[PDB]
């Protein structure tokens, strides 16, 4: 019947992280692995549920702890450490790589077949990680607040890229989306961008409206369609 | 085993059209109907194959004859017909509606569950037809050279809209895509736009390169992914 989950301790320098690894015990042997990067709030029920859903699709999934000590922040207390990441992208990248290493350390994971998904800040985190040249098959971002690349990033992405974007999301500027697409074009990345009408930021979270942060709202249609697009990409590229 | 096809005679004023209707004889009773609008060349093997593939998915599909007398043009001989449509959008719309009426006339079609897909000019045709307020559940455009709306079109689309766009297609301007998306936003249409990286115009046709028209090339990845997105939307909205 049910999927199983277990805590995974890992480190990034002096920071101790506690992720949660989801897999189907009913399935035997190595299988594709997915890192799930949460929203800025941190490792929360939303991210863990997405990892569970991935285990139910036949994957081994690690819900990542970016902040360390499984810390969760509310809207008020958040800028430390989110600005920490934007102001030091090398540090941000190492923290993401630590999660990918923790995934690949699990014996249920086929290390040759790994991907990453992420939500909001976690979506941005997927793209940062891909830009290091990590050996990812695919990344999928969900309402990710993507950044333009750093000098030296050109040509490094090895993964397929699917960006699922809320078409009315006020937190992501048109100019940024165009710049990122132009990077993908330049490098001939295997890329897609799916614009989801009537969707804003955090469209995948039924609690999106609970934070009192403007520009965040749930849209079940966008959640379903983006998840299906992700599922299709993984089925195409794995197995 | 195999799907079946039959010719369907219909008229738009003085113009006699000969479409081709595809269905599974193994399936009994009314089923969702799809009009397939071809590229500018006219009713050809490419369009008929897509109608066949739709019949294999459980739909009743009419490959439309826009030009009349099942006429096909090559790249050289094409403009007199095509400029005819762009210079008289009301006429273009009536010609499209005649195909939709011919579909709905077939006893295998559930008239309450109809959609339209189109390729290139046929994609543009789907959007023109939806702008009349036709009772379509969904339209899906594949490398469609979409036009901005006519004065008086606002609020009229009742269908879901999925636009599958080749991200490097030189025949469709960024400004046009942005304008169309802004119409969808304004009216709160149930819309998506899927940008397919590395794809140009006519990405769904393995013969795209055979016409000697610059900007046209096949991309099997884009063909597959756009077809899957279409199939998903139909499964979501029908049944
Ligand atoms: Cl669903
Ligand atoms: Mg490459
Ligand atoms: Mg509406």
The closest alpha carbon to B58, from B95, B8, B24, B16, belongs to B24
Give the number of residues written for chain A.
239
Q: What is the DSSP string of A112-135?
A: EEEEEEEETHHHHHHHHHHHTT--
**Spatial separation of the C-alpha atoms in residues B219 and B166, rounded to whole Å:** 9
- Structure-block tokens of residue A35: 């890192």
* Other CB atoms within 10 Å distance of the CB of residue A204: 25
3-state class (DSSP) for residue B226:
helix
Q: Angle, to 10 degrees, between the axis of helix A79-86 and the axis of helix A121-131?
A: 20
Q: Cβ–Cβ of B190/A197 closer than 8 Å?
A: yes
**Extended beta strands in chain B, E state:** 4-12, 15-23, 31-37, 60-63, 109-119, 138-142, 160-166, 191-196
DSSP for residue B208: G
**Both tokens of residue A210?**
């609970």
| DSSP codes of every residue in chain A | ---EEEEEEEEETTEEEEEEEEE-TTS-S-EEEEEEE--TTBS-HHHHHHHHHHHHTT-EEEE--SSSTT-B--GGG-HHHHHHHHT-HHHHHHHHHHHHHHHHTSTTEEEEEEEEEEETHHHHHHHHHHHTT---SEEEEES----PPPTT-TT---SEEEEEEETT-TTS-HHHHHHHHHHHHHHT--EEEEEETT--BTTT-TTGGGG--TTB---HHHHHHHHHHHHHHHHHH--
To the nearest whole angstrom, how far is the Cα of B222 from the nearest Cα of chain A?
9
Closest to A134 measured CA to CA, from A109, A164, A99: A99
Burial A91-101 (b: 16+ CB within 10 A, else e): ebbebbbbbbe
Which residue in this structure is represented by tokens 């939307």? B233
Query: CB under 8 Å to A134, separation ≥6 — which residues?
Result: A97, A100, A158, A159
The span from the CA of A150 to the CA of B57, in Å, is: 45
Contact A228 B225 (CB under 8 A): no
Rounded Cα distance, B58 and B115, in Å: 13
B190–A198: do the CB atoms touch at under 8 Å? Answer: yes
B11 touches chain A (CB under 8 A): no
Place of tokens 């439309």: B64
Residue B198: which of A188, A197, A228 has the nearest Cβ? A188
A193 touches chain B (CB under 8 A): yes
Tokens 């000969």 found at? B18
Identify the structural domains of chain B with CATH numbers, from first to last. Answer: 1-239 (3.40.50.1820)
Q: Give dist(CA A143, CA A121) in Å, integer.
A: 9
- For A53-73, letters b (16+ CB in 10 Å) and e give bbbebebbbbbbbbbbebeeb
Q: How far apart are CA A234 and CA B164, in angstroms?
A: 20
Task: Judge: B191–A197 Cβ closer than 8 Å, yes or no.
Answer: yes
Q: Which ligand has an atom closest to residue A229 CA?
A: 1
User: Any chain B CB within 8 A of the CB of A167?
Assistant: yes
Residue B98: phi, psi to the nearest 5?
Answer: -60, -40
Q: Is B232 on the interface with A (CB under 8 A)?
A: yes
């Amino acid at each position: 019947g049910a999927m199983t989950a277990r805590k995974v301790d890992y480190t990034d320098g002096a920071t101790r992280c506690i992720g949660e690894f989801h897999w189907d015990e009913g399935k035997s042997g190595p299988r594709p692995g997915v890192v799930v990067f949460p929203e800025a709030f941190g490792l929360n029920d939303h991210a863990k549920e997405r990892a569970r859903r991935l285990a139910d699709l036949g994957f081994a999934a690690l819900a990542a702890d970016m902040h360390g000590d499984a810390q969760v922040f509310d809207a008020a207390s958040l800028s430390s450490t989110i600005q920490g990441y934007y102001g030091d992208r090398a540090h941000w990248r190492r923290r993401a790589q630590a999660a990918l290493d923790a995934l690949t350390a699990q014996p249920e994971v086929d290390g040759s077949k790994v991907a990453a998904i992420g939500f909001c800040f976690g979506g941005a985190t997927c793209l940062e990680l891909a830009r290091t040249g990590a050996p990812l098959t695919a990344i999928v971002t969900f309402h990710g607040g993507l950044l333009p690349e750093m000098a030296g990033d050109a040509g490094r992405i090895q993964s397929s890229v699917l960006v699922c974007h809320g078409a009315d999301d006020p937190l992501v500027q048109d100019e940024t989306m165009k710049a990122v697409m132009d990077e993908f074009r330049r490098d001939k990345v295997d890329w897609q961008v799916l614009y989801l009408g009537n969707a804003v930021h955090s469209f995948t979270d039924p609690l999106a409206g609970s934070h009192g942060i403007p520009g965040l709202a749930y849209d079940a249609t966008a959640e379903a369609r983006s998840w299906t697009a992700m599922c299709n990409l993984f089925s195409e590229l794995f197995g």
